[PDB]
Amino acid sequence: CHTAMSVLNPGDMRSRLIYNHLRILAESVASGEMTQRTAFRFFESAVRSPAYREIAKRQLEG
Amino acid sequence: DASNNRFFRGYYYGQRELHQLLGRPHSLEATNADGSNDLSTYEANTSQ
Amino acid sequence: EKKRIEARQMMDGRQALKKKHLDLLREFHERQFFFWYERASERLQNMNLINYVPHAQLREHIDKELDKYVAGKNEPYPLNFVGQMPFLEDGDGNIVEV
Amino acid sequence: IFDGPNVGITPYGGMTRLLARPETSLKYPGLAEFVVLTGASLFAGDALRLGWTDLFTTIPDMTYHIKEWFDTTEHMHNDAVAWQLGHLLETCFKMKE
Amino acid sequence: RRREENLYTPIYDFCHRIREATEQRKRFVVVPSTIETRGCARVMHDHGLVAGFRDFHNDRAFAVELKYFQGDSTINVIEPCSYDGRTEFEWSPKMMRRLLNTHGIHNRLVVYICRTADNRIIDHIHAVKENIGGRGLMMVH
Amino acid sequence: EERRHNIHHTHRPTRPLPDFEEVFERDVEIDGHRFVLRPRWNPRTLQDV
Amino acid sequence: PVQKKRQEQMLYGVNIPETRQMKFEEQHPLLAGALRKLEGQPKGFPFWYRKYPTRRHAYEYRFSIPVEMLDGYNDDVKKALSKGMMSIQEKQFAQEAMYMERYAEHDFDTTSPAVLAVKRALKCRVLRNHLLTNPHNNIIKTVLANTERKLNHALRRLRKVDFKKYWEIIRDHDVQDILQPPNLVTYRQGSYWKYDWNAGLAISTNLADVMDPR
Amino acid sequence: KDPQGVQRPSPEVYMKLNYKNPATISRFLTRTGHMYPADILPLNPEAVVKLRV
Amino acid sequence: NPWLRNRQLPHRRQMEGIARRVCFVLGIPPSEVRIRNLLLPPTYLDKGSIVRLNDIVFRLSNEQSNLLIPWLTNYNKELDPKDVDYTALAKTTNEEEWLTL
Amino acid sequence: VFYSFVLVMKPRQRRFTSQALREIGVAVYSNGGLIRSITNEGIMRPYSRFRDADNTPLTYARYIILQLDMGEEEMGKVDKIIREHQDVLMALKLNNLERPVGIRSGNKELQAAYFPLDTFTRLEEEINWSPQTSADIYTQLEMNWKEFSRTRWSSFLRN
Amino acid sequence: ANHPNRQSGIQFLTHYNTHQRFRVNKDYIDYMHWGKEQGQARLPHRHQRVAFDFNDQLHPTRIGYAWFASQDPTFGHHPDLSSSFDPNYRVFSHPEHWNKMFTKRRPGEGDIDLSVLPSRSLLGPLMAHSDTKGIPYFKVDNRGHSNGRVPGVNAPFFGEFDQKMMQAMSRPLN
Amino acid sequence: NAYAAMELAAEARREIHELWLSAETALEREKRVQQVAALIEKYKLDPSTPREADVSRGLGDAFDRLLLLCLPLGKTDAKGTDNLERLMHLAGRNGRELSVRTIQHLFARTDSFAEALAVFYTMRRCHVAMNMEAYYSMLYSLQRLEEEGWGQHFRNEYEENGAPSEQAMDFIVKGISNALLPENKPWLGRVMFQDRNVPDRRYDTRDFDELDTAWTQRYKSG
Amino acid sequence: SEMFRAYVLERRGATDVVTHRDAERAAAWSQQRQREYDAYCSLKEAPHPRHVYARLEGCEGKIVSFEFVFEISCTTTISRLKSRILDALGMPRDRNIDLGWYLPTLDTCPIHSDEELMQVLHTDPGIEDPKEKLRYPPIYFIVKRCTLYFSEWAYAVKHQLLLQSPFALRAAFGLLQEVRG
Amino acid sequence: SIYAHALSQFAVCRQPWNEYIGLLTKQDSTPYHTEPQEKPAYRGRKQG
């Protein structure tokens, strides 16, 4: 829920890249390998695309 | 003297007094290995 | 020796520059003086319009003033500094009209 | 600006090749002589259409972003490198949307 | 402000500025501009302890740009050699040579920075190279 | 300016200084085109070359 | 008696020395020629500006109003900007500017030892008489003592810059009391003379004019 | 926007904040004549000086 | 001083000034006046400077010069590499005046 | 102004009021000072009863505004003269009139840094507004500005 | 440090003459009304800061658009050019400026200096108004921008904007 | 209606240019002043004239070269200063601001000192807001007046001698002793970082003409 | 200060009222100033008979001159001026043409509207050489062509080919055809 | 420049990217814009 609703602009979530980030972290929240906090802070700090904010100014206002 | 002997180029007691006497500008961390930033006026206007 | 001739070249340069700075500062001061005169002249022109009570005109003025509210006139009366209509006294300052 | 018959000399800098590629004769017949004879400027659009270069960007201070993107990047194996560079190119310099 | 207090050097304070701006994870620091200070800056930028630096020929200051890696700083610790200006520490070539040696293995990790009789600001490794002794400034790794 | 006021920049100088009047020819007429200012090339015209 | 005389001579008023009118005439003879034509007639162009290079230079009338700017106005105005109408603070600033002008080496000079010494001498006198009247404000006891210390510095720098101005400052304002070495102990160690070593003028003398070096 | 009003009063009011404007004094006091505690009716420090004076 | 040269040769304002002042005093017609600068090396004097001193300032045809000054033929002295640029001067903008001389 | 006064006075028979104001005026002229305006107002009803020399409380009193130019030294003399006169109930003194509260705070004055001559030239009335002032003077003011600014030089450069 | 009046801590990254913020006799801070936008009340105000964050903007260059003519015709006001920006700006602090200590702290009491906040009174613009136009018309002043000719401010600006400082600190390779 | 006013203003400017292109010794000080006054009183250039049917609107740029045609004031009366302030007053009404070039040549026109003061005072009466341009042009004009006085003195003394003194020489070199806005320090006379010295010397008519003609050729070509 | 002492007390109807004794006088004054403003503005619109110079922007030098009366009360006048300019230039009247003001400061402005144009007439007195005798004050316009024709284009390109060293023109053509092969 | 003049007619202005990217159709757009409320800051070690 938090990854869907708690994050403004988590890139395009359809692209295989960010998708694989999400997949892996989920499988690591299940099976207790990571804490939810750590997995969430991972998810938002995961690598997306160079000059990310400045590309975000080309789509989103706020 | 201050070129070949490290004990001379110690600043805050020997070199400081000297520079104040001779009227050079000086400071803690300076350009010359000395307290001295620059020559005094006598040294700039006179060939020794 | 070489170090000293260029060190003094630098020094004399710098002293020359602070002379030049000196002229520039004088000149700036003159400038803002002319402007000062612009404003100050202008204010004093207005102060020349003030009617000062001289010693010769004193009691004439005092009495022109004590008669400001004399308890009858044909014209509208001036207010106070506190913005009131005060009591209209006749000659000699008796309280006639409230 | 490939010019210099205007300063009384022949153009230098190799761009002559680009101008004489059979490709340019195809797309813009006559352009080669236009630019070589008349000193006249070419710009992003025309460099793109002649296919002189593939890459274009409107982003402020691209240089910083390139720097700090390659700082977050990790290994030196040429797969990693291929992808990192390629992803950078695709996201900014190749024109979509 | 008073007697017993240390007498500060624009080295002491240079170091503590960098330290503190590394702790608050800032990208730029404004720093005092004297000779051995920007000397130290160049040395640190050589060893890659600092992202970059510039002097603008501003008189008071110049500015350093800090580097971070894996979430924390590139600088573990940075300490001045002397608390006062009234104390001046001299480094023999042999001492500076000792620093380099960790029980028989040659270790360049930590960097120590010197004035020379010649007014150059050097690391201890070049110093040892030519066997000159120099005055201590700081140590950073 | 230098050309007018400085002898050491004109007469037998160290390094040469360009002259405007020499570089440019004023008011040229070539076959329907009026040039305010056109430079001086020794083969003046395209036909001449 | 001397200081007292200085305060009485500040209180009732001050004056610009015609020293300045003189040098104004010999330096810029054209301008003084113009003003010389225009006496008594109201001026719209301030020819007199060279005479007053600084805001502070005009003390004869309040708010830095040069005398000849008052030509075409009312005489009530003339009495309104006169000395008699100054506040006390203004009058101090008057004494200060006139003296600062006497000892200045150029017009915009403040920092120089002579100027400093005089201004501090005056300020010190003012605070002194102030304390004479209203006994306990220790804020100003302290400000007086600090001013005095800074005066001591200025003077001991003066006598190594040039000593005759030093002399006649001491003779004008009667401060010899703050040049007296404080106590025998520190004097005996040569730390009274040690001062001008620190100030850096210790070698400044340039013998050859006095005291043949041979 | 103003935690402690520098906006209150608006400019012209200042003119009348002297001793001879009983009305304009009164619009800044209580019904008893006391001033309002700072965090009740916040005023630009100018206005407080001029007012108590 | 390479610092103090930049000022040394007169401003155009001063050349205009001197010109019309000569016009006042000498009676020379302002129509034809040609006022020029010749600026010589600081510590010594090369061939070039003497040639352009002989040739231009005083008008001397080469024969009356070789007559009057025989040794010019053997005089080879020329500018040293260090001294080459004394002629070339720094150009300062007018909003820059407070910084550099 | 340089100085101002408000003089709350016992409402006597006019010859006495004229005498008293002549006493005060002569007390100002003696001490080498000027009077910008001596303004008369009526007999008002204050918020506080005042007692005069007889300790007889007073419901009514005449108000009189003074505007002076002195030195500050002998205004001490003028002041202890005024307050000691039997027919002056109260006197309030305004010394702030050259530098009033509204100026010289954090570059509030445009085109200058504290030009003192503004509020000196002025009379008290326009520094401290009286209650009756409304938006109307905003018109009057400028008809008196523009007008003034037209004729000043012409009138000054006459003589 | 638990001592009161020592709470402002040790900051080196200030511009003051001591690294111990609590001995600094210049600017006394205000814990109750301060720190809306700077976080803690101890820390330096936005305009006075001598150390800068990665993703935060740094100080605006002051002016005191004509010079962008060579740029994109659309380009608006460059975010770092400010009309009014002062590094020396006194922020109102009650314990300094309104000091209630010698009083009982009742409503009107406390001593105030008004030289801090710019005057909102009408008295200023009324008193000073004049037929002579202002300082800028009169071109009273010498100098100009203190750095002489400046591409953003005085003269025209060509080429590129660098908003990150990337070129502005680089190392000469030559 | 006012179209007629403009037409008659075209006749006006036609004869203004007629008299300005004279610029001769046939045009003496007396002659020029009375010819100018004649033009004014022919075309009703007083401030009394109504707003419409005011002849000076449609004199463009003929206005200021009519204006500085007033300037050297003949020796009869103090009447002269009025012709000038008629013209100027009209400007103040009509809305045309006075260009700095115009008033720089206007002071450059001045023969004596009291005349320069006369002009400054005149535009004081005319509600001209003084600038640094006004002030510096004035000072420059004073300076060239004295440089002219001394130039005259030394040529005079050179004539009765036949070879110049050294005072003549160093006067020629460093100019006026202790001048205001001097040449040796050029950075002083400046205003907008542009240098202000027009007024330092006299100008003929063809000089003025040269400047604007140059401007016009510049348009017609570049 | 004598404005502020001028209020007064009068009774209107049944009620007491404070008024400025001079209020209506100031009103008459402000009214007069308003009517003057009006006269002035209206007169700025009044017919302005000025000489017109217009320079066509381009490598082909041409400058059209004619006398023109500007009537600025009742857009259409700008387009009358444009139509005329085109008539003299030898072009159809439908050319999209940008007028622009050539300033005496050597700057340039666009003029999009009449209310502006009136002010360009008013503000610039004209700058003219008097030896040359014009009956009216000139103005100086620049004319930008929003549409190049082919004829135009070729003109420009010929103007440049004629403007560079022939030997190098011919040379460089040789060089291109030699690289090209 | 004395003559670039021939070049200047077929010369090309530089395109308006700032407002073009401003006016691109965006997926955060709102009929009426609202400014975000103020975010939580760090008030120091005791406050969090």
Automatic annotation (TrEMBL), chain A:
Gene Ontology CC annotation, any one: mitochondrial small ribosomal subunit
UniProt superkingdom: Eukaryota
The protein, known as: Uncharacterized protein
Organism: Trypanosoma brucei brucei (strain 927/4 GUTat10.1)
Lineage: Eukaryota, Discoba, Euglenozoa, Kinetoplastea, Metakinetoplastina
Range covered out of full length: 124 to 185 of 307
From TrEMBL, chain G:
Protein name as annotated: Uncharacterized protein
Native source species: Trypanosoma brucei brucei (strain 927/4 GUTat10.1)
Lineage start: Eukaryota, Discoba, Euglenozoa, Kinetoplastea, Metakinetoplastina
Shown part of the complete sequence: 109 to 322 of 429
TrEMBL record, chain M:
Organism listed in the record: Trypanosoma brucei brucei (strain 927/4 GUTat10.1)
UniProt protein name: Enoyl-CoA hydratase/isomerase domain-containing protein
Shown residues within the full chain: 631 to 824 of 1211
UniProtKB/TrEMBL annotation, chain N:
Organism domain of life: Eukaryota
Protein name (record): Mitochondrial ribosomal protein S18
Span within the parent record: 7 to 54 of 320
